[PDB]
Amino acid sequence: AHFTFQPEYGQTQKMNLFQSVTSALDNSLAKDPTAVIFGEDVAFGGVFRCTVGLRDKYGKDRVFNTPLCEQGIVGFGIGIAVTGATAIAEIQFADYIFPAFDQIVNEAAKYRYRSGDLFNCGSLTIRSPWGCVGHGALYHSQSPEAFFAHCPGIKVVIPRSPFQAKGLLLSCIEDKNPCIFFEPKILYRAAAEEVPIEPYNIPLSQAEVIQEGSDVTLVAWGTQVHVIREVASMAKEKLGVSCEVIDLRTIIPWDVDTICKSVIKTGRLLISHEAPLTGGFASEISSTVQEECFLNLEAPISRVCGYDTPFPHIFEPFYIPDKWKCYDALRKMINY
Amino acid sequence: AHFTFQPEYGQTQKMNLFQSVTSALDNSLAKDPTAVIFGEDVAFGGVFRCTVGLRDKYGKDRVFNTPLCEQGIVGFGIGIAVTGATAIAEIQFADYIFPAFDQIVNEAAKYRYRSGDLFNCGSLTIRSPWGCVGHGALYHSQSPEAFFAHCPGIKVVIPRSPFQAKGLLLSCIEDKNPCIFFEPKILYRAAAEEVPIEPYNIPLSQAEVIQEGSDVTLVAWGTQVHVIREVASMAKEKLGVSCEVIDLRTIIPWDVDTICKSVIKTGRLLISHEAPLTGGFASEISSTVQEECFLNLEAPISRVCGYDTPFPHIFEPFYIPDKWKCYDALRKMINY
Amino acid sequence: KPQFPGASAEFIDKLEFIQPNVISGIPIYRVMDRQGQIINPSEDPHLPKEKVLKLYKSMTLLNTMDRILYESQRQGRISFYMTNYGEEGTHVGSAAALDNTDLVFGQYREAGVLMYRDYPLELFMAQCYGNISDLGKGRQMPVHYGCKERHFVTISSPLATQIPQAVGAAYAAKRANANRVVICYFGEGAASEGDAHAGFNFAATLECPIIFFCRNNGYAISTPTSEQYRGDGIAARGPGYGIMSIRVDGNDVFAVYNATKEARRRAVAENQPFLIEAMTYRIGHHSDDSSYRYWDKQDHPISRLRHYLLSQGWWDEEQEKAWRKQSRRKVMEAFEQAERKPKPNPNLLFSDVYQEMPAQLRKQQESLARHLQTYGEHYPLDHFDK
Amino acid sequence: KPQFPGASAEFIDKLEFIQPNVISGIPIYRVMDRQGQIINPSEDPHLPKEKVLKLYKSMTLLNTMDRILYESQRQGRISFYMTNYGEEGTHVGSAAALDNTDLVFGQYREAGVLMYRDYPLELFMAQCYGNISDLGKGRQMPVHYGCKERHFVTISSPLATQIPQAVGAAYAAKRANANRVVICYFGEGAASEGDAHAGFNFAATLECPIIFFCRNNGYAISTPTSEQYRGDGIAARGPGYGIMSIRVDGNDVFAVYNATKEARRRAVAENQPFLIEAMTYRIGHHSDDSSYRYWDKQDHPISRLRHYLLSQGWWDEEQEKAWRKQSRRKVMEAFEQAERKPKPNPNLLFSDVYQEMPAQLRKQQESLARHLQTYGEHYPLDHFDK
Numbered sequence A, B: 001a002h003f004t005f006q007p008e009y010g011q012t013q014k015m016n017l018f019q020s021v022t023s024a025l026d027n028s029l030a031k032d033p034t035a036v037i038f039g040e041d042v043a044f045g046g047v048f049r050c051t052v053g054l055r056d057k058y059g060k061d062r063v064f065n066t067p068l069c070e071q072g073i074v075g076f077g078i079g080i081a082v083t084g085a086t087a088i089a090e091i092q093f094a095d096y097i098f099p100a101f102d103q104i105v106n107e108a109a110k111y112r113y114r115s116g117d118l119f120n121c122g123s124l125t126i127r128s129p130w131g132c133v134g135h136g137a138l139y140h141s142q143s144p145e146a147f148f149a150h151c152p153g154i155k156v157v158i159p160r161s162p163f164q165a166k167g168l169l170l171s172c173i174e175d176k177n178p179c180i181f182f183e184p185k186i187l188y189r190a191a192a193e194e195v196p197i198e199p200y201n202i203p204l205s206q207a208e209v210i211q212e213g214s215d216v217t218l219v220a221w222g223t224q225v226h227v228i229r230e231v232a233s234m235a236k237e238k239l240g241v242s243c244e245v246i247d248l249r250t251i252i253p254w255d256v257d258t259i260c261k262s263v264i265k266t267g268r269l270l271i272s273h274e275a276p277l278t279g280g281f282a283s284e285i286s287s288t289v290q291e292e293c294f295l296n297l298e299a300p301i302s303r304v305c306g307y308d309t310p311f312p313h314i315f316e317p318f319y320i321p322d323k324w325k326c327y328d329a330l331r332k333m334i335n336y
Numbered sequence C, D: 001k002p003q004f005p006g007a008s009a010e011f012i013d014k015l016e017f018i019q020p021n022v023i024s025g026i027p028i029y030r031v032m033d034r035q036g037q038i039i040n041p042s043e044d045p046h047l048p049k050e051k052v053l054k055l056y057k058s059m060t061l062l063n064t065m066d067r068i069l070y071e072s073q074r075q076g077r078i079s080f081y082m083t084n085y086g087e088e089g090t091h092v093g094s095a096a097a098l099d100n101t102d103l104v105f106g107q108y109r110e111a112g113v114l115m116y117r118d119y120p121l122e123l124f125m126a127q128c129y130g131n132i133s134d135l136g137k138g139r140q141m142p143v144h145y146g147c148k149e150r151h152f153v154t155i156s157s158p159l160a161t162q163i164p165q166a167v168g169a170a171y172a173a174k175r176a177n178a179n180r181v182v183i184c185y186f187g188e189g190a191a192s193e194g195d196a197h198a199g200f201n202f203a204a205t206l207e208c209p210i211i212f213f214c215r216n217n218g219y220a221i222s223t224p225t226s227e228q229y230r231g232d233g234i235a236a237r238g239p240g241y242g243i244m245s246i247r248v249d250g251n252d253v254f255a256v257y258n259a260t261k262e263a264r265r266r267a268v269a270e271n272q273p274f275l276i277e278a279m280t281y282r283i284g285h286h287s288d289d290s291s292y293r294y295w296d297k298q299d300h301p302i303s304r305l306r307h308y309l310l311s312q313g314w315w316d317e318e319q320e321k322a323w324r325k326q327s328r329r330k331v332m333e334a335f336e337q338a339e340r341k342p343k344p345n346p347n348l349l350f351s352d353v354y355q356e357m358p359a360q361l362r363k364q365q366e367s368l369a370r371h372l373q374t375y376g377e378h379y380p381l382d383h384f385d386k
């Protein structure tokens, strides 16, 4: 495709991203008797196979299909969580999460605050396939994280691999706040990796420096992390530039300290994401970094993002912020 | 309240903000036979009186009530616009626009693009009361502009006064793109000003420098413009600081040139808005300004915004980015 | 024979469109007339005297509180208020038929349910005033009540959002097998929202023990029902979702009680939803000068219940006078105490956004503290706790 | 007598819940049997030979195109595809009853409506291939057809969004007084969305000339209708909104035609909505390996229409053979031509976002141009126009 995937807790087994999600869900229903999983077509295993075998193993009352209605799926999930039961809702494609926007933003995110903590829906998690897939076009490709980033009260988490996905998803399911977990669908079947069979957690609101560097900081999340990892390689080989590569992982609340600490050292920052530039989450990272590291910034922070248009079908190769686009902006920034 | 309002086209008449909206709507139905106005409770004049007398003057088939359903109001409006008729939909409070988020973002904004321009809903305008009102709490106070700013295909426009409101609203109604017009409700009855009786237009995507300055640039929109205008006065009197005050007016597509040109001259920027800091539109302005004026920035750009919490009832006086908060940040920035 | 999986039906060989029956809609169940007389003995619930007096006193105490808080708003002492005029019987009648632990979701006109569940006058007032005693910590606009102890989920302004939520809570109750029902209140206007279609359908397909209680008072702010829908009210929508439905006289506490009692009994036993549409009339303003538009001197829930009491020898003029005096006293004591309490600590504007407080949110809270240290004289610090 | 503004009804003195009639639902209107025989003479539409042959040829040409494009996808030549197997009669039958200028909104299974309206094979192919001849400029996934000339509004992926939109277009048509109707197609799964509740209710209260056409094929991807709803299908929901409704045998082009013709006639004259639920069976996969689960050898729309033709002496085996050969030829000619055309100019990724192109968007377009000047070898430039 446009990226290449590459890369303590006991026995592990090779798993691709969708299998690691199933493993996280299986571990959750096994240790939490109240947990249920529901949404469109989850009973037979899901359109991306993330729930295969779970209904047979745990029961039709715990893994079941709902009517085709996203606002209902989320309102229903909030209600289960209000009683304290773990509710793991699925939205079939992140592009179809909008009908539930009011239930997410006006209700789920504000549930605890507005009640003085008399009620909450902390045990709610909404998972949904996310990101481009080569030919998904307008409604099978979206990255909606920036729409949710402007909403206090919810957490938005995005993994970059099977190992990261299972650990971050278990943390979302167990976190006491409503969580939206976006699963990069292009990775569902792309390259497996070793994943612990038993449950483990990866912390939320913690970015991960996957490669140390001293000349510039590169930040991304999801599949785009693989793109910047490659860009780091291109910079080192073609320019003798040392790149510090960081996977943000949690969109909100985000790990401001890790990013600033990195930029204070390198003095340069390039942020990249598939979502459109304007109002994208890179603008929040850039603003914040400028405010905390003004003294250390040796050049303007660059944002290499999708263009300010809907996501196209036939033009996708020209739309995405690929390694060449990131590389070029990095080159110009390094030459600043 | 927390602000003070103060401030060619023929005969004018004193009008407060709600009257100027009625005047713009009246001018529109008079010159455009296809135009209709609809939404919850608009027939008797509206809960904020913006449609008083329009049904009697133009007919029940042109100014009418819809069932209580925001997703239907917008989908219905899109449909009228698809036939080329002017559709002016009302959403009762901006806080209740979310049920229509999918129709706005997945449909209205993408209608022309996705059809290769075979179909469009350019003649659609959605108007809605917006902003704090002193005691509106969580659902009668919101400023949702940043959620919409991340969506290519729609325009988001916010006025600061009766004169600005009528001119910007007529431009929205006549613009060939779906527009969301947010009316600062705290201004509906607050201080009138002279407004032309006949139609006139104020351009979209054009910020307005309402006061020239040379030491720092202050940017805001809606009621917050009055707050920074006062902050400018406080800075001049208490610090001998010359402030350039700019009303952004159009959130997207925004007037990047005017802001950068101003910052290139002053070398300093403070952006302020009632909406929460994280993911707020100030982060987009700040990012962009940093990218275009890195060489001219003498200090980190500051954002004085509402806190990252839902909008509270009894604590509102402590939540809003008032003149003192903006002043203090300006002081610190000037002393940088 | 038709073999289609989507429906069970016979073939028909003549073209016939199905016509809605609106002129002669689902009949309105009534137990007592406007004179408080039991119309059909077999339908008398024969509720004990103590319980009927509690229904009466709850709804008159609510009415006394309404009058006082409504005036308080008019004076700008509280920022907002919504009365329960004409809705008193739908609320006490249905609340009396529930078990104390049945979970209630609703919106703006359910205060009577809390009153019946003995919610303290002091807490109704604390929330409207947003003072230190408010467990909601003064964050929401007035009348957005909530009580964990009395299983009354916190009300929120966005209409109908509580409907699919109530369904989820009912599904979870089914699974916990606690023999509990969930009741969800909403008006006929809110029923036009997409979330109502979501909740009704999910409740039927997921077999949930829930009672949907629609208060149809003929208006949603200024909109008459003729502009809200064209079918036979909300009751007629229930069967289309496979939901057992009924329409009752909302000004008749006994009709409301009987319908709710029976719905609760079957919903919990059969894990199936029930829809009750209570016909009433919004006597008071929406919140708004109602005068876009009889039920106070000819058909009022309180008046009918009062006549019933008299016919049993359970009430009289002197008891009426003493109770009006005592309830007024009780309400004014809570009111004055509420007005005098300070508001909560401004720091509470930052907690509960998430369960824990994110570091970046703490930094905003520290930012305020620093701001107040320097500019405090420009803020109402003396009115707030600490 | 009940005086409530929300409904028109009598009082009832006995507690009776209204039970849904699902086991014996609204009957299925049928005109011809599985052997293509007219069951009831008074219902025969007696359509002229030329028109019936056009119904037949349109639906077999659609089937030929489906087979070919389905295989093309399997080979990865096109990125996505959705067939119309078993839906051919609902589409040609209803399209034949409309006036050429009636506006159509739908989704994924309405290609037959475009085919009946003579949409060119070349344009169906251009959209699936996203080549230079696509008026949609290759921006949407395959089968997201649209034609301004044939009044077929561009299809979008989000289910049910076109429902309240179709209602708005119908309201505008009412006002323009052009004696036009709007028809809106959707499946039984999409009917669970909140937007369906929105459109149905608005169409009735705002008195709109629209036909809601629900294709109920028993499944929404892997979900059987038993998990989609519990009422008597979608037809039974119409009366609750005050909408004239009917259920028809979707594998019977004449039942579909008669119901649509009559709905169009009354909708345009009375400015009132009509709901037609066509019972069918999704024979092909959703898009997905259907094999979560007879209608091809015992009850297929094409087969029934073919038997009808034979009984009139309007078709025979030789004509069948020649047509299968000619349609295959026509489809393969369009297919090969479509595959050989280049894709549109990459610059078209930037136009039509807004009518005009914002300066900041132009800057992004210039940014790409510069990028390609330098890194062009890493992009498929030779496959795209200019």
Ligand SMILES: Cc1ncc(C[n+]2csc(CCOP(=O)(O)OP(=O)(O)O)c2C)c(N)n1
Pocket: B040, B068, B070, B092, B096, B099, C109, C157, C158, C159, C186, C187, C188, C189, C190, C191, C215, C217, C219, C220, C221, C282, C286
């Ligand atoms: C989603 C949403 N839209 C609009 C409003 C504004 N609003 C508050 S009450 C109301 C009328 C509701 O009428 P109904 O449901 O019949 O209840 P009633 O007030 O008659 O008891 C409206 C439109 C809201 N609170 N939420």
Ligand SMILES: Cc1ncc(C[n+]2csc(CCOP(=O)(O)OP(=O)(O)O)c2C)c(N)n1
Pocket: A040, A068, A070, A092, A096, A099, D109, D157, D158, D159, D186, D187, D188, D189, D190, D191, D215, D217, D219, D220, D221, D282, D286
């Ligand atoms: C809002 C939304 N949610 C989910 C989907 C994914 N999806 C595409 S088709 C489909 C099934 C629709 O079933 P139905 O409406 O009955 O039509 P059929 O495919 O049977 O013709 C689903 C869930 C979508 N396109 N849009």
Ligand SMILES: [K+]
Pocket: A122, A123, A124, A125, A172, A173, A174, A175, A176, A177, A178, A179
């Ligand atoms: K959670």
Ligand SMILES: [K+]
Pocket: B122, B123, B124, B125, B172, B173, B174, B175, B176, B177, B178, B179
């Ligand atoms: K417009």
Ligand SMILES: [K+]
Pocket: C106, C107, C155, C156, C157, C158, C159, C160, C161, C162
């Ligand atoms: K609510």
Ligand SMILES: [K+]
Pocket: D106, D107, D155, D156, D157, D158, D159, D160, D161, D162
């Ligand atoms: K659609």
Ligand SMILES: [Mn+2]
Pocket: C187, C188, C189, C215, C216, C217, C218, C219, C220, C221
């Ligand atoms: Mn009402």
Ligand SMILES: [Mn+2]
Pocket: D187, D188, D189, D215, D216, D217, D218, D219, D220, D221
């Ligand atoms: Mn279907």
